Write a protein that binds this ligand. Structure first.
Ligand code: HEM
Ligand SMILES: O=C1N[C@@H](Cc2ccc(O)cc2)C(=O)N[C@H]1Cc1ccc(O)cc1
Length: 394
């Protein structure tokens, strides 16, 4: 006799566990136990994952209710789980959307210059180089400093919170509140800084003084900057890191994109589809009794949407483990979510990876792992799957 199935199955981000395909075929919605001891429904087929994400009766906001079954402990104040809803209710949705588009002036040129500059420094240091710590994460940090309008020099200060902020823990984390309060104070001070006139924070600083927004709290302005820095940097840094592994593992594809850089957008979209950067299913709480497949999910129960369950579903993406640049439904993957909470930084995340991969293949076309792939150290109890170091030669 053995306990219920425990999630997550594996912290490894370079291969999908064989357990996923067996669940999807036999039990596409199945009861599991989370690290807090709570029971939850895990949803692993394309059809059921999309149904859950498009039905607003499965609520993100309500996962923060006291006494709800939990996937993990909150590392933010409970109101911040409703971050996007708080933004829209204060009338700030359009303003935030336009600050994070990759079409901001000089932003693509900044991304390319910063990428090339990071790679030159790696080249002059000599091999081996760490493509996570000395390329992907700094490129992500620099990009979000620029998007936010804050000094590049403050990037590493704010990045320091992220190894704790995005932890996937069974219990509350004392350090997370310390860093949160300190980071909120930093962004509050940015709003009072007359030199901050560009980017998201520059725009928020001027809306703050506009009569149409005089009843929006200073707390919310500062929260927008912390949350968008944190979610954007950890999501873009982690995706680009694990996308470089899938590329290194496929030298034919690596060579094709080097000779034909026009295929990089199509390649990045497949790298998004097969990416394993999210370490847990997306949590939602049922606010009603709702039929999902063969199971009646009851009000108050937790449902977990497994992104790789949908994205590797052979009924929607035939030969799902293969990168194919000519699929007829290329953007229909769930790497950015779906429905109400679709990622607002999808365009920016796509552009970060395209420019990073393009710069890498032009400077480092023979890039390869400097250690056997089994030697990578995968971070555990974290909301993203990432190797601690990514040593490469070229
Ligand atoms: C490759 C990069 C990225 C990936 C794979 C990614 C993935 C995702 C996914 C799957 C969700 C939905 C979560 C859910 O429904 O529970 C989401 C939401 C979100 N993302 Fe992204 N994201 C990326 C980049 C970004 C960037 C660049 C930003 C901002 C600078 C950002 C900010 C947000 C925010 C604030 C939400 C919450 C949206 C809401 O609650 O309505 N993300 N992301
Ligand atoms: O809880 C939230 N918190 C912030 C994201 C966030 C989480 C932790 C943190 O330290 C900073 C930001 C939000 O914008 N919305 C929600 C939902 C969310 C959670 C994780 C994630 O990766 C994206 C969205």
């Amino acid at each position: 006799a053995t306990v219920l199935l425990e999630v997550p199955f594996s912290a490894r981000g370079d291969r999908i566990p064989d357990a996923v395909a067996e669940l999807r075929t036999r039990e596409p919605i199945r009861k599991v136990r989370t690290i807090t001891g709570a029971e939850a429904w895990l949803v692993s087929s394309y059809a059921l994952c999309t149904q859950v994400l498009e039905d607003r009766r499965f609520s993100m906001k309500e996962t923060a209710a006291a006494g709800a079954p939990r996937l993990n402990a909150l590392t933010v104040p409970p109101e911040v789980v409703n971050n996007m809803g708080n933004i829209a209710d204060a009338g700030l949705r359009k303003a935030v959307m336009k600050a994070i588009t990759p079409k901001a002036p000089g932003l693509e040129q900044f991304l390319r210059d910063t990428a090339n500059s990071l790679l030159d420094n790696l080249i002059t240091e000599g091999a081996p180089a760490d493509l996570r710590n000395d390329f992907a994460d700094p490129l992500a940090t620099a990009l979000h400093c620029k998007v936010l309008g804050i000094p590049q020099e403050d990037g590493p200060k704010l990045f320091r919170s992220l190894s704790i902020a995005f932890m996937s823990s069974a219990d509350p984390i004392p350090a997370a509140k310390i860093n949160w309060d300190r980071d909120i104070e930093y962004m509050a001070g940015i709003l009072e800084n007359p030199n901050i006139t560009t980017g998201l924070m520059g725009e928020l600083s001027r809306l703050r003084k506009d009569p149409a927004y005089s009843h929006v709290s200073d707390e919310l302005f500062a929260t927008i900057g912390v949350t968008f820095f944190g979610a954007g940097v950890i999501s873009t840094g982690s995706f680009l890191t694990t996308a470089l592994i899938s590329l290194i593992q496929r030298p034919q594809l690596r060579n094709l994109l080097h000779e034909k850089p026009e295929l990089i957008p199509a390649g990045v979209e497949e790298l998004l589809r097969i990416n394993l950067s999210f370490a847990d299913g997306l949590p939602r709480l049922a606010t009603a009794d709702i039929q999902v497949g063969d199971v009646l999910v009851r009000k108050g129960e937790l449902v977990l949407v497994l992104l790789e369950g949908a994205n590797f579903d052979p009924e929607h993406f035939p030969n799902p483990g293969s990168i194919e640049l000519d699929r007829p439904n290329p953007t229909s993957h769930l790497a950015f979510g779906r429905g109400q909470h679709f990622c607002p930084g999808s365009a920016l995340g796509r552009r970060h990876a395209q420019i990073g991969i393009e710069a890498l293949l032009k400077k480092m076309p023979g890039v390869d792992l400097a250690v056997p792939i089994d030697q990578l150290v995968w971070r555990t109890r974290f909301q993203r799957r990432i190797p601690e170091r990514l040593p490469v030669l070229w």
